[PDB]
Design a protein around this motif. Structure first.
Motif, mmCIF file in Angstrom:
data_model
loop_
_atom_site.group_PDB
_atom_site.id
_atom_site.type_symbol
_atom_site.label_atom_id
_atom_site.label_comp_id
_atom_site.label_asym_id
_atom_site.label_seq_id
_atom_site.Cartn_x
_atom_site.Cartn_y
_atom_site.Cartn_z
ATOM 1 N N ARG A 154 19.012 21.012 33.765
ATOM 2 C CA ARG A 154 17.833 20.428 33.133
ATOM 3 C C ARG A 154 16.991 19.659 34.142
ATOM 4 O O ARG A 154 15.756 19.711 34.102
ATOM 5 C CB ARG A 154 18.260 19.515 31.984
ATOM 6 N N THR A 166 15.166 22.085 36.467
ATOM 7 C CA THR A 166 14.278 23.040 35.817
ATOM 8 C C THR A 166 13.181 22.392 34.984
ATOM 9 O O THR A 166 12.045 22.871 34.999
ATOM 10 C CB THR A 166 15.077 23.997 34.924
ATOM 11 N N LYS A 167 13.489 21.324 34.250
ATOM 12 C CA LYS A 167 12.509 20.741 33.342
ATOM 13 C C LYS A 167 12.274 19.257 33.586
ATOM 14 O O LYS A 167 11.167 18.765 33.347
ATOM 15 C CB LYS A 167 12.948 20.955 31.891
ATOM 16 N N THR A 215 7.484 22.469 32.793
ATOM 17 C CA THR A 215 8.653 23.280 32.448
ATOM 18 C C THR A 215 9.139 24.133 33.615
ATOM 19 O O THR A 215 9.803 25.153 33.404
ATOM 20 C CB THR A 215 8.397 24.172 31.224
ATOM 21 N N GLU A 234 17.084 24.055 27.262
ATOM 22 C CA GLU A 234 16.923 24.967 28.385
ATOM 23 C C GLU A 234 17.347 26.390 28.054
ATOM 24 O O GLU A 234 17.285 27.258 28.932
ATOM 25 C CB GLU A 234 17.712 24.458 29.593
#
Ligand SMILES: [Mg+2]
Ligand SMILES: [Mg+2]
Ligand SMILES: [Mg+2]
Lengths: 467, 467, 233
Positions: free
Chosen positions: B165, B168-169, B176, B212
């Motif tokens: 997470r 990636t985000k 995102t 995710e």
């Protein structure tokens, strides 16, 4: 004039003995083994407790010695991969097929980058100054005992010489081999190829102590270098160190709140030499272009400043690395000459003005900040107090005089690391005063900030009776 | 069945826009750029303040999260260079010429090794347990609000899902995409290819959160993997992590004085499975052979123990790395199959018994030490107190209830990092309770030990009136 | 209207100056915020202020000054220019709309909005709110002050409530001491016989007691009465 075969020598100083079951090399190149040795060394781990410029106790993601060393190693490895995978024909010529450049050059550059600040004294650069000052007061030049120029090694103490000593002689086993790095790595470690005994104008500082002089000579005999001649990869390592300094120190300054991204942009734009520099212009334009889109989104001022400086770091590092690689490729023939007189790789590159402006910004905003100066003074006081307290128990141990026989002196001597005292008690040709001063320098340089403060406080508590 | 072309995809999730002057790639491969992104990330620097097993305040050269991550990255890079330079024919078959294995495989393994413990909660593994316990008490399963299995993501909180997470985000910009790593790197990050919603026996823990899930699906669609199928390099990364755990934790135990080199030798010799293991026998013989010559010289007991354990570390790491490489080479066909059922690479290697014995020694001597247990309890108390104090200001922010409108609740909400709250306030399809719990998990996981303790003390001081 | 306009101008300008002095921002940050502001991109007053600030800043950087000194005097010049422009705009707006102000049906909310310095003042207020009012230290001290005030108010209400309604829960020694600690004039007004409701009189006594205290006095009284409230808690 110099050949890459000698400059990339993979032999080691320690003579070979060992059964096949004891072979730990496996599928690793010798220089890769040197990098692994440097990474797994205890001083490498201890570097995390030493401050680079700013205090590490705060959780502001500041860079310590370990983080800076890893970043320099990464930059050097990137430059090495670029040289060995793309610019092989332009740079490496007449290289024997027995040398795998793709596995040796990046590993060598990473290894010398990681170890460049491994033997430096604590409390940052100021620490060195403090040590020098202490020696300048406690090893008077007018005195007959400390009249020779060799004691300058301590009156102008440098971290590079101590790093070479620590990777060559200053280990637990007194085999005069230390980590037993390859000849190429040891040659690349020597930043200034001169000693305090010799007088040179190309290099200001000395690169090795008297005790390691013979070792350095051996390195030269096995590398093809000589006094006053610097290994070509040392230029790349120094350029990477300077780039990391100039960029990441500015990033830390912005993060700590001593300045803002707009302040740095205005300083770069209004700089005398950066008004017409193409690299600086491109960096500023890219930063503003990203900052417009960045302010489009909803971000806090701290977040905007942080990521704007992240983008500035990316652009500046890319431009400076490209300029350094181009300069090294263009001046490869001069670097391979026995009479090379280039002071640094950055000055010959197009990123010279940007790096100089970044260094000036870091000096004006970060290095001369009130908190930084206060902590530098505190560290200088700690170092000088500990040095006096140790000298109370070190002086006379080799000359013959017996003022150290006090219980406090004996305890202070016993508190020093065992390997340092083992080397000091060895029978060599060094003068007794030189041996005592070298013992003190080795003891002080090997300590971290927290360890130095704790030892200073403990011995101050234990020194109450004799004071 | 799987192809290396898809498994080594260098594409990125973020769609391409950008002029040539903004190109910062230079002569770097995309996976090398991913490694550079991971190294220069702020959490990578913050990892230095997080303890691995033992306290980092003492100057005993213990290994923190950053040092352990760097060692794992170095081991993974060594294995990658061995695979790409020697075992290329045996391992990599039918690989397109557009993929430079010699530059991608070592970089990929190093990048996934460095980032493997980047999103883990503070206070070591115990921290995770504490978080889980807190959630298990504050997100009851019998309650209708927290009855769904998705909330298990918090009742069985894992550091791997939080790391995915965070890479990636969970960045400052809510695009995102995060660091925008390549598809190969993201695929290799997923340790357990399953979620808490799915029930599997091959993998015990879940590897990604619900939020995710779509991202993970995209990764699979761009890599050729699927649910329950693990990337081949993830096995190598896990083997390197296990080797580093088993060896360096034992070294730290010996350094801290909880045991001695002879104790470890006796434990290995008397172990039930290590009595007949060839690897263990060779390690013991080499250790004793070096220890005899080592005791010949004049060394202090501490110095002798330290360098004897250094030699043990060298021999054990060499043997385990060789065994892991051999096992990976032998079972390469099974790893490339879509129905791979191998739990770990070490169990298929000849160093399984030695690694298991080292793990047992570390558990018995180091992990269950009185000081370690006391600090684990202190960290659990700190984490649970901070979680309750934050939940006082987080709960109801998304469901609709307004018990958070107290001044303490508003200040507590404001103390959370801005990016976490920006992601939490975004309008998505996640349930409100899930969003609140994810906000708390992101806030807690991103803190270091010192930062967590300082925030806990500050808010405890500020919570006096409302208590 | 003139008093409120002057108060708003002082707020918007001097709070920004204090923010720059305290190190929460820099002069260049404020210049960029004003330039990039949506309503200040075309405002004549903002344009003139920015141009004058840059013109003085070039000559100011010619001399050898430390970054702190340069920022300080650059913000001093910004304060001078902004205050001059805003005061002139406010005076012009008051002169132009004097007839409406003298009307019994005046509906003007504030004088600044009718002036040409409305955009600059709004941008300065937004900058002060984003940089200074929402700073971490400011929020922490606001929470501490809120806790102090609420604790002191509860502690005083323990001795104030019921003094006028008739109920006698205040007769505890702590309640009597707390009542005696209030200023004599406030209690004299509270004990006067008027037409105000008893609960209103009690609440007004508490409000007068709390409002008349300074920060140091409030903290000292809170700590002292907290020490003296240990037995009854
Ligand atoms: Mg450096
Ligand atoms: Mg690990
Ligand atoms: Mg006012």
């Amino acid at each position: 004039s110099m050949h890459w075969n000698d400059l990339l020598n993979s032999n080691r100083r320690k003579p070979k003995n060992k059964e096949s079951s004891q072979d730990t090399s496996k599928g690793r190149q010798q220089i890769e083994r040197d990098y692994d040795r440097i990474l797994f060394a205890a001083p490498t781990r201890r570097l995390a407790d030493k401050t680079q410029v700013f205090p590490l106790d705060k959780n502001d993601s500041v860079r310590t010695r370990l983080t800076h060393s890893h970043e320099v190693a990464n930059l050097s490895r990137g430059i090495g991969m670029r040289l060995a995978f793309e610019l092989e024909d332009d740079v490496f010529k007449d290289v024997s097929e027995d040398i795998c450049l793709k596995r040796d050059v990046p590993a060598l550059l990473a290894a010398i980058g990681l170890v460049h600040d491994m033997g430096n004294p604590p409390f940052g650069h100021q620490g060195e100054k403090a040590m020098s000052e202490w020696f300048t007061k406690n090893l008077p030049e007018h005195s007959d005992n400390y009249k020779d120029k060799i004691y300058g090694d301590f009156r102008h103490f440098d971290g590079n010489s101590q790093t070479l000593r620590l990777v060559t002689k200053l280990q637990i086993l007194n085999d005069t081999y230390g980590l037993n790095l390859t000849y190429a790595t040891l040659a690349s470690m020597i930043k200034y190829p001169r000693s305090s005994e010799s007088d040179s104008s190309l290099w200001k500082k000395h690169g090795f102590f008297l005790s390691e002089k013979d070792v350095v000579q051996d390195i030269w005999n096995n590398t093809g270098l000589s006094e006053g001649v610097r290994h070509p990869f040392t230029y790349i390592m120094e350029a990477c160190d300077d780039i990391a300094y100039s960029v990441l120190d500015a990033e830390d300054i912005i993060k700590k709140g001593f300045a803002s991204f707009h302040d740095l942009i205005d300083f770069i734009q209004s700089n005398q030499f950066c008004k017409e520099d193409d690299v600086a212009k491109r960096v500023i334009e890219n930063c503003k272009k990203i900052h417009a889109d960045y302010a489009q989104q909803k971000l806090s001022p701290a977040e905007l400043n942080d990521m704007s400086m992240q983008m500035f770091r990316v652009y500046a590092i890319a431009e400076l690395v490209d300029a350094v690689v181009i300069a090294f490729k263009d001046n490869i023939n001069e670097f391979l000459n026995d009479t090379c007189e280039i002071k640094d790789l950055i000055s010959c590159s197009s990123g010279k003005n940007l790096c100089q402006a970044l260094k000036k910004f870091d000096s004006s905003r970060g290095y001369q900040h009130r908190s930084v100066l206060k902590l530098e003074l505190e560290g200088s006081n700690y170092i000088k107090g500990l040095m006096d307290m140790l000298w109370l128990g070190i002086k006379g141990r080799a000359t013959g005089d017996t003022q150290y026989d006090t219980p406090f002196g004996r305890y202070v001597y016993g508190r020093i690391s065992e390997n340092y005292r083992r080397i000091f008690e060895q029978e060599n040709n060094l003068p007794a005063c030189y041996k005592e001063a070298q013992l003190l320098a080795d003891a002080i340089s090997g300590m971290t900030d927290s360890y130095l403060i704790a030892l200073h406080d403990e011995l101050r508590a234990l020194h109450q009776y004799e004071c």
